[PDB]
Amino acid sequence: GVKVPRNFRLLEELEEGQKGVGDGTVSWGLEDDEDMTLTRWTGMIIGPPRTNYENRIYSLKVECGPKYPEAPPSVRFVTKINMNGINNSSGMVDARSIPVLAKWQNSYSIKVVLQELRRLMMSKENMKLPQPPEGQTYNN
Amino acid sequence: AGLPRRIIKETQRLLAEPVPGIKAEPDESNARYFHVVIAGPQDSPFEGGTFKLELFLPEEYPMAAPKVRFMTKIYHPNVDKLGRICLDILKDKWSPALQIRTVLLSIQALLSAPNPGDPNDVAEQWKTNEAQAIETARAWTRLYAMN
């Protein structure tokens, strides 16, 4: 079929981010509003209800490299979180442990990644994990 | 089994009869994706500079407008911080009768004669202090468009 080139796909995601989607429990935008490369993004996830993540806002950094969206983006939590697939010391998201990233398709997007991480927060193996104090962030 | 004739024609015409001051090269992977360089027009504050632009022909081309954006930072009332271009024919006034060549020289004409009146800080600066806006445009040309 017809592939939309990286920069134009990212402009589409930019506009969708600004319009917002669904109930607004995930959101994304450019980290630097003068970054013409559209590389570094800020992600936000509202922790889901009836989990240990509830009523907490999670900030993330999402990096869309030169081969995005053929290649998956790199993701890390800024806000500290105890969650399977997330390195507990650095916040880095292990792609092999998150199915959307391990089985990446070029139809996916920053939105899809954030929605998946939020869905996974509701999983039996995550929803009961004791969390660090609210507000803490990793370094680097 | 490939591209519509029009695209083949327009692609081949861009490489055979190039618009003066404008270079266009095909992407090495995407036959609807083009890398453009526009020379700053003579007697403009962008003169002497070269500006990277990218062009994409969407599936619905020519029913749908081509997608165009600056990749070189530029101080201009019709170009934003991410390089997006506000030009009638790229959205509202686009018709299939227009072609890629028309878009490129129109963008070039925009550089030759900025339109501050267009419904941002840049455009507003160009209205109230045009002299300073022009020297700022020249400054950014020196900083971002000379290599």
From Swiss-Prot, chain A:
Record-linked PANTHER family: UBIQUITIN-CONJUGATING ENZYME E2
Cited function: Has no ubiquitin ligase activity on its own. The UBE2V2/UBE2N heterodimer catalyzes the synthesis of non-canonical poly-ubiquitin chains that are linked through 'Lys-63'. This type of poly-ubiquitination does not lead to protein degradation by the proteasome. Mediates transcriptional activation of target genes. Plays a role in the control of progress through the cell cycle and differentiation. Plays a role in the error-free DNA repair pathway and contributes to the survival of cells after DNA damage.
Descriptive protein name: Ubiquitin-conjugating enzyme E2 variant 2
Organism: Homo sapiens
UniProt-listed PROSITE patterns: UBC_2
UBC core domain sequence ranges: 5-140
Induction comment from the UniProt entry of this chain: Up-regulated in cultured fresh blood cells upon treatment with vitamin D3.
GO BP terms in the entry: DNA double-strand break processing; error-free postreplication DNA repair; positive regulation of double-strand break repair; positive regulation of protein K63-linked ubiquitination; postreplication repair; protein K63-linked ubiquitination; protein polyubiquitination; protein ubiquitination
One Gene Ontology term, aspect cellular component: ubiquitin conjugating enzyme complex
Organismal lineage: Eukaryota, Metazoa, Chordata, Craniata, Vertebrata
Tissue occurrence: Detected in placenta, colon, liver and skin. Detected at very low levels in most tissues.
From Swiss-Prot, chain B:
Modified residues (N6-acetyllysine): 81
Superkingdom of the organism of origin: Eukaryota
Chemical reaction(s) catalysed: S-ubiquitinyl-[E1 ubiquitin-activating enzyme]-L-cysteine + [E2 ubiquitin-conjugating enzyme]-L-cysteine = [E1 ubiquitin-activating enzyme]-L-cysteine + S-ubiquitinyl-[E2 ubiquitin-conjugating enzyme]-L-cysteine
SUPFAM superfamilies xref list: UBC-like
One matching Pfam family: UQ_con
Activity regulation description: Activity is inhibited by binding to OTUB1, which prevents 'Lys-63'-linked polyubiquitination. Activity is inhibited by GPS2, leading to prevent 'Lys-63'-linked polyubiquitination.
Gene3D superfamilies reported for this sequence: Ubiquitin Conjugating Enzyme (3.10.110.10)
GO molecular function, one term: ubiquitin protein ligase binding
Protein name listed in UniProt: Ubiquitin-conjugating enzyme E2 N
Gene that specifies this protein: UBE2N
